[PDB]
Scaffold this active site. Structure first.
Site, short mmCIF file in Angstrom:
data_model
loop_
_atom_site.label_atom_id
_atom_site.label_comp_id
_atom_site.label_asym_id
_atom_site.label_seq_id
_atom_site.Cartn_x
_atom_site.Cartn_y
_atom_site.Cartn_z
N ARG B 175 0.83 -1.19 0.00
CA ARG B 175 0.00 0.00 0.00
C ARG B 175 0.87 1.26 0.00
O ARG B 175 2.08 1.21 0.27
CB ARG B 175 -0.94 -0.01 1.20
CG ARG B 175 -2.17 0.89 1.07
CD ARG B 175 -2.80 0.76 -0.31
NE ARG B 175 -3.48 -0.51 -0.49
CZ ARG B 175 -4.05 -0.90 -1.63
NH1 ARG B 175 -4.04 -0.13 -2.70
NH2 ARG B 175 -4.64 -2.09 -1.68
N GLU B 240 -1.84 -6.41 -10.04
CA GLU B 240 -0.71 -7.25 -9.65
C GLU B 240 -1.19 -8.59 -9.11
O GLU B 240 -0.64 -9.64 -9.46
CB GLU B 240 0.15 -6.54 -8.62
CG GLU B 240 0.63 -5.16 -9.03
CD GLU B 240 0.94 -4.27 -7.84
OE1 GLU B 240 1.36 -4.80 -6.79
OE2 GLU B 240 0.77 -3.04 -7.95
#
Ligand SMILES: O=P(O)(O)OC[C@H]1O[C@@H]([n+]2cccc(S)c2)[C@H](O)[C@@H]1O
Lengths: 483, 298
Positions: B175, B240
């Site tokens: 993140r 991803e």
């Protein structure tokens, strides 16, 4: 102007007397807290006030008492003593700790668990690394660097900030051996998280400064790049603003090599730091430090030969903050230069004395790029051999950053740069001789020396050897209307 | 170079009526004009300070100064004075920081040959020579370019040189804020142990995941909150994860401050990945956690 010191020095006297007379752990901690708060309040004013504080502390032997409190078994007494120690490590007290106080700090470096101890010893190690090369080498030989790495593994913001500043200081003041030992301990890899952490901008700024200082040592740039922490330097410099951190002499003399480092990340870091320092100095009336060091010439050279937008912008801002005219960037097509471009390059390289002499001879891009020693000595009136050598160094720097596409046919500049980045300066000579990639297989040493102007025999031998080793009914017709 | 000796010398000078000299910066190649001036007053050549200033001599020019330049440009007519200046310059070159210019640590090699041989390090570097290039150097090149006037030194250097010289493994999904620290620590620890890890800072995203030998997503506190119910594949982290699932690389999630999201609210692709075991991250034992991850890895 020092009435604050006048009524604060007695307060220091009673504070230290009570701290020494205190036998209980809590009373000693309270006295240390009082001294630390007084030091902080003085700092919030006052550089000279804190200097006077630390002078009295050193004279009364307070730092020895802090050392033996660091030796005391009580942990909290140690934390208050180290809290005082972080803020009383001025240059003279730093010398005193180097001479007698060292060795005790290593015992603290053995302790790893407490966060407060980590922060305090990180700050103390930072100041000690700012002291001298011998102390840096001794600390590296000890576990101080390992303690810094372990605290870098931690998460505390202030601890990480002190560790980053410690690594920067030790890289700046260590020397070749200290930097080699740091890289052998993977200093850049542990510097990477500090720069990557988005929580605090100052932590990344300090980590990038440390990485740039390590990169200035170009015998280990290979491993520094293998670490990969150099990549984040440019985007962070572009994102950050000098004004915010500016608002928030030896240091400048050590930052100047970063400006002249010829490494893009190091140049950007140096430009950012010098712009911030120039803003801070121009906020006051003292701005002659940069002129005395000579960083103005470095900034002008950076602007003229700038290839990065961020670095050029930072250098232009730093120059504009001072009373110096920004130099207009030079056109890379040196072979196509007219007289005006040669003149402008002359004022950029600070040879305005010879501008009139160059104008009279009507020197242009080709004549400047093929200028010789005797022409400078006789025609242009550059009598001094040292001045001629400086001019030739500047000319070599110019020839390294030049657009030879107008004259190079076989992209020989790329081949010369592949041999060596400094070999590209001979591209114009080799082209004007008519040589190309195909013709270099038959070139001789004497021809090189006489015609191509490669005076250094080592360069001629390298070029010759490397060249010898490396070099060896239309289908469709169209029928169309006019419009 | 020693604190005790420097302190004693400073005390002795201060006891007398002599100004203490400020220590010189060892990085002679990086010296500016002021450093050259200060070295000049230290070596007691204050008469030539103005002459040096007019020529604007700096670290490089001083470190490559020659006999004729001193004789003509700097007005050092006396040969004895020039020899004294060159002795001082040799003493300076012995104690110098060449790291800014030395690439192969040639100063160490020259010092190993002879402590007095280190003075030629700057000349050899400015000639472009390094450890690899010294095997082909000739006597004439040394004399003309490197400035080694003494023939004995040239012969010794030549003989001694001739005799002596002769797809990332792991990808990180993190993140913006919460996962940054953990991702940095993970990548640095894996690199310290010999694991090549590529951490970024859409088209390049797919190739980056495909080239990754193993995929290790950082399950930071609230890492999949943005990827939750992300059926539109808007998040790049979602891209991803989907690419890693399509490739089916080795997945070893690391657990910290977050739990496994419910499969029903998630797309089936990341429904598949939720069955993999995770490893708790410990701040008290970070290296131990990394060792455990490596033990579970290949
Ligand atoms: O500049 P110098 O004398 O080399 O060292 C700076 C010293 O001053 C202390 N400090 C500076 C500013 C504000 C506070 S609270 C404390 C630092 O702890 C350092 O030890």
């Amino acid at each position: 102007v020092q009435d604050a010191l006048e009524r604060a020095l007695p307060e220091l006297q009673q504070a230290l007397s009570a701290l020494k007379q205190a036998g209980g752990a809590r009373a000693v901690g309270a006295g240390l807290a009082e001294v630390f708060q007084l030091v902080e309040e003085a700092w919030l004013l006052g550089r000279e006030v804190a200097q006077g504080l630390c002078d009295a502390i050193r004279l009364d032997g307070g730092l020895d008492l802090l050392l033996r409190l660091l030796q005391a078994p009580e942990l909290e007494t140690r934390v208050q003593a180290a809290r005082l120690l972080e803020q009383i490590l001025v240059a003279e007290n730093r010398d005193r700790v180097a001479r007698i106080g060292l060795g005790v700090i290593l015992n603290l470096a053995k302790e790893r668990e407490p966060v407060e101890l980590a922060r305090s010893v990180a700050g103390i190690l930072e100041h000690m690394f700012k002291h001298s090369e011998e102390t840096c080498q001794r600390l590296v030989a000890a576990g101080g660097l390992d303690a810094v790495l372990y605290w870098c593994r931690r998460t505390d913001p202030a601890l990480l900030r002190h560790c980053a500043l410690a690594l920067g200081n030790c890289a700046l003041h260590g020397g070749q051996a200290v930097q080699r030992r740091m890289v052998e301990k993977r200093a850049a890899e542990w510097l990477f998280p500090l720069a990557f952490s988005k929580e605090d901008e100052l932590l990344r700024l300090h980590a990038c400064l440390a990485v740039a200082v390590l990169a200035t040592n170009k015998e280990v740039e290979r491993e520094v790049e293998r670490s990969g922490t150099l990549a984040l330097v440019e985007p962070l410099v572009a994102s950050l603003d000098p004004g915010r951190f500016a608002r928030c002499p030896d240091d400048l003399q050590r930052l100047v090599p970063l400006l002249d480092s010829n490494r893009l990340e190091a140049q950007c870091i140096g430009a950012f730091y010098l712009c911030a320092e120039a803003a801070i100095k121009s906020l006051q009336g003292k701005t002659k430090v940069f002129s005395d060091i000579g960083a103005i010439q470095s900034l002008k050279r950076l602007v003229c030969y700038s290839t990065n937008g961020t670095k050029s912008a930072l250098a232009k801002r730093a120059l504009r903050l001072l009373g110096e005219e920004v130099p207009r960037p030079i056109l890379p097509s040196v072979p196509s230069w007219k007289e005006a471009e040669v003149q402008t390059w002359l004022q950029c390289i600070g040879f305005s004395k010879y501008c009139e002499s160059f104008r009279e001879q009507q020197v242009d891009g080709d004549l400047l790029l093929r200028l010789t020693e005797e022409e400078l000595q006789t025609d242009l009136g550059m009598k001094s051999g040292i001045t001629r050598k400086r001019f030739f160094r500047e000319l070599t720097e110019l020839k390294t950053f030049a657009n030879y596409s107008t004259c190079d046919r076989s992209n020989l500049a790329d081949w010369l740069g592949s041999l060596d980045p400094r070999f590209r300066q001979y591209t114009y000579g080799l082209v004007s001789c008519g040589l190309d990639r195909s013709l270099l297989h038959r070139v001789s040493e004497q021809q090189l020396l006489e015609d191509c102007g490669i005076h250094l025999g080592v360069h001629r031998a390298r070029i010759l050897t490397a060249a010898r080793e490396m070099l060896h009914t239309p289908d469709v017709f169209i029928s169309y209307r006019r419009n | 170079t020693n604190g005790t000796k420097s302190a004693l010398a400073k005390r002795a000078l201060r006891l007398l009526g002599e100004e203490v000299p400020r220590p010189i910066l060892p990085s002679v190649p990086s010296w500016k004009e002021a450093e050259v001036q200060t070295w000049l007053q230290c070596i007691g050549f204050s008469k030539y300070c103005e002459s040096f200033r007019e020529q604007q001599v700096d670290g490089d020019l001083l470190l490559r100064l020659t006999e004729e330049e001193l004789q003509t440009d700097l007005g050092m007519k006396s040969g004895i004075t020039r020899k004294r200046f060159f002795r001082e310059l040799t003493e300076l070159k012995t104690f110098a920081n060449y790291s800014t210019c030395d690439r192969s640590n040639l100063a160490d090699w020259l010092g190993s040959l002879d402590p007095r041989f280190r003075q030629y390090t700057y000349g050899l570097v400015s000639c472009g020579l390094d450890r690899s290039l010294l095997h082909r150097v000739s006597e004439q090149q040394l004399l003309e370019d490197c400035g080694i006037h003494l023939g004995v030194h040239r012969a010794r250097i030549l003989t001694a040189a001739r005799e002596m010289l002769h797809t990332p493994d792991v990808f990180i999904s993190y993140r913006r804020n919460s996962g940054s620290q953990l991702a940095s620590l993970l990548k640095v620890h894996l690199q310290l142990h010999g694991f090549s890890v590529f951490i970024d800072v859409e088209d390049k995203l797919i190739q980056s995941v495909m080239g990754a030998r193993n995929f290790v997503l950082v399950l930071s506190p609230g890492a999949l909150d943005k990827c939750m119910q992300d059926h539109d594949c808007k998040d790049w982290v979602h891209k991803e994860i989907v690419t890693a699932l399509s490739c089916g690389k080795n997945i070893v999630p690391i657990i910290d401050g977050f739990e496994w999201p419910e499969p029903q609210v998630l797309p089936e692709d990341m429904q598949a990945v939720l069955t993999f075991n995770g490893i708790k991250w410990s701040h008290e034992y970070q290296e131990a956690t990394i060792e455990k991850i490596i033990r579970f890895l290949q």
